[PDB]
């Protein structure tokens, strides 16, 4: 269950990287 | 407690999807 | 340690609510 | 593994502080 929790936290970190990707996209629209 | 933690992580993932919807709403205002 | 982890996840959820607060403030600047 | 999970949660919180850094930078482009 700890190693299910770590691999939920990895796919939270992936959906923060998708944070990062939108924040280059908005900074084209605004930068 | 592990399967309480996994179901806090699910309702963090839900509030990243609300990330996603706001980052659609801001791209109507800016796109 | 599980109920330390749950209360790190509470203070991640709080800093997603600060997500919501800024996505109110940017939507004043743009809405 | 609990104290591996807490230290994934710290490096999630760090990548939320980077939320905070960008939401200073966009609030220069817009404020």
Query: Which residues of chain D have a CB within 8 Å of the CB of A20?
Result: 18
Cβ atoms within 10 Å of D17's Cβ, excluding its own: 11
Contact C30, B30 (CB under 8 A): yes
Of A1, A4, A15, the CB nearest to B19: A15
Q: Which two tokens stand for residue C6?
A: 């749950």
Name the DSSP letter for residue C25.
H
Name the DSSP letter for residue C1.
-
CA distance B6 to chain A (A): 6
Judged by phi (left if over 0) then psi (alpha if -120 to 50, else beta), residue C12 lies in alpha
Q: How far is CA A4 from the centre of its chain?
A: 18
Helix axis angle for C2-30 and D2-30, nearest 10°, is 10
Contact D1, A3 (CB under 8 A): yes
Contact A2, D8 (CB under 8 A): no
**DSSP secondary structure string for all residues of D1-31:** -HHHHHHHHHHHHHHHHHHHHHHHHHHHHH-
Subunits next to C (3 or more Cβ pairs <8 Å) are B, D
Residues 6 or more apart whose Cβ sits within 8 Å of residue B2: A1, A2, A5, C2
d(CA A12, CA C1): 21
Task: Provide the residue ranges of all domains of chain B, joining segments of one domain with +.
Answer: 1-31
d(CA A14, CA C21): 22
HEC sequence for A1-31: CHHHHHHHHHHHHHHHHHHHHHHHHHHHHHC
Resolution (A): 2.0
């Amino acid at each position: 269950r700890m190693k299910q929790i770590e691999d939920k936290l990895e796919e939270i970190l992936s959906k923060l990287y998708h944070x990062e990707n939108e924040x280059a996209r908005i900074k084209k629209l605004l930068x």
